[PDB]
């Protein structure tokens, strides 16, 4: 029941305007502009009520995207539609920028007319949109394209052909960790997703398998999937079966909290010498095989607010003390497993009030590692196409694990 859909820029101008219901008028755009973009207070909510009228807004790059309704619309549905439309526009023309919107004006208006009709979100998987939306022939291909837009299998187009049946698997994870100094893990959480890039011909029936037995096996608390995968089969017999849409798509999402392998062990050592000098040394142990090279490693060591000088000593890598962040940022380009590194730091403290004790913030660390912290490994992935003659052996499979750190903090 999306009454109207508007897009603004950072200046405040209306890049595009489209209204689907009479109840929404020209006043809604002005009200949103005066109330949300130019709001005096920064404390808001994603959805706001303005004179018996609801506005949903999300921000992509420097571009505002808003949807206005005067009915009791489903909030989650509207937000998911906004995300999906952002994804579709990104799939067409990359970055969602002002000049991109200006240049592709007709294309975005085609999308607005098609993917939504009288406030009811229609098919928007952009697999079918490529077929009949550009930037003759006979009834055959026309009925084919109409059925593939409206039918059950809407994500994949009928006439996909390739000379090299290859697919790409990407296991992306973000870890949230907060370790207590007493050796007890106070909070653990791993969020992951499997991104699949498929270049396959026909309508393959793909089976995805992993170590989800519930000699490597992990206990996943729950799995949240894509649309293309059949959820009824997953519930009935614990099988992941899907037809991969052409191009990139997010196959599944998973959450893990047990049996988490720690990439590193943080041992902080703080020595207090009166009120002038502070000795802090941090040593990290690489708990993985040496064949894996850790990359983009960032260690953030907090410093007292009354620090007058910081000395950096490092044998491997470089240690940077930046006053802009008021912390010591220690970066290492690469090292292998079962390696160690040490830093010597001298903290000179300016005079301050004796009453004010120092509440140490946690030591935040950022890293990217080739291994998956949860331990999820793709055991197999079967592909079968009855219509064509290529077998599973003809298909070439690739897998990559990129585990990026999320909120990785260490109490000191």
């Amino acid at each position: 029941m999306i009454g109207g859909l508007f897009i603004y820029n950072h200046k405040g101008e209306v890049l595009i305007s489209r209204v689907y219901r009479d109840d929404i008028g020209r006043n809604a755009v002005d009200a949103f502009r005066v109330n949300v973009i130019h709001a005096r207070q920064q404390v808001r909510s994603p959805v706001t009520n303005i004179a018996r009228t609801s506005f949903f807004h999300v921000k992509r790059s420097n571009i505002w995207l808003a949807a206005v309704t005067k009915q009791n619309v489903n909030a989650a549905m509207v937000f998911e539609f906004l995300y999906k439309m952002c994804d579709v526009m990104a799939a067409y023309f990359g970055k969602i920028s002002e000049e991109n919107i200006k240049n592709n004006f007709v294309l975005i208006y085609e999308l607005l007319d098609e993917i939504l009709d009288f406030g009811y979100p229609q098919n928007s998987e952009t697999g079918a949109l490529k077929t009949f939306i550009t930037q003759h022939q006979t009834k055959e291909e026309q009925s084919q394209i109409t059925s593939q837009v409206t039918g059950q299998i809407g994500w994949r187009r009928e006439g996909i052909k390739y000379r090299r049946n290859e697919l790409f698997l990407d296991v992306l994870e973000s870890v949230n960790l907060l370790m207590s100094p007493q050796g007890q893990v106070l909070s653990a959480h791993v969020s992951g997703r499997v991104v699949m890039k498929s270049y396959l011909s026909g309508m393959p029936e793909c089976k995805f398998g992993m170590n989800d037995k519930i000699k490597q096996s992990i206990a996943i608390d729950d799995c949240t999937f894509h649309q293309c995968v059949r959820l009824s089969k997953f519930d009935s017999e614990r099988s992941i079966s899907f037809i991969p849409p052409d191009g990139e798509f997010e196959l599944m999402r998973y959450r893990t909290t047990k049996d988490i392998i720690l990439p590193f062990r943080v041992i902080p050592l703080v020595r207090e010498v009166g009120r002038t000098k502070l000795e802090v040394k941090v040593v990290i142990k690489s708990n993985f095989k040496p064949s894996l090279l850790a990359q983009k490693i960032e260690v953030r060591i907090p410093t007292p607010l009354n620090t007058s000088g910081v000395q950096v000593i490092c044998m491997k890598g470089k240690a940077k003390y930046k006053a802009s962040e008021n912390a010591i940022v220690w970066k290492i380009k690469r090292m292998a497993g079962m390696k160690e590194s040490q830093i010597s730091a001298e903290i000179e403290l300016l005079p301050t009030n004796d009453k004010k004790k120092w509440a140490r913030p946690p030591i935040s660390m950022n890293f990217e590692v080739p291994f998956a912290p949860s331990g999820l490994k793709v055991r197999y992935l079967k592909v079968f196409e009855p219509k064509l003659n290529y077998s599973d052996h003809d298909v070439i499979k690739w897998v990559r694990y990129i585990g990026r750190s999320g909120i990785y903090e260490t109490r000191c």
Binding site: F168, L169, V378, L381, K397, W398, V399, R400
Partner: peptide, 5 residues
């Protein structure tokens, strides 16, 4: 990056 599956 890419490893054989």
């Amino acid at each position: 990056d890419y490893q054989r599956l």
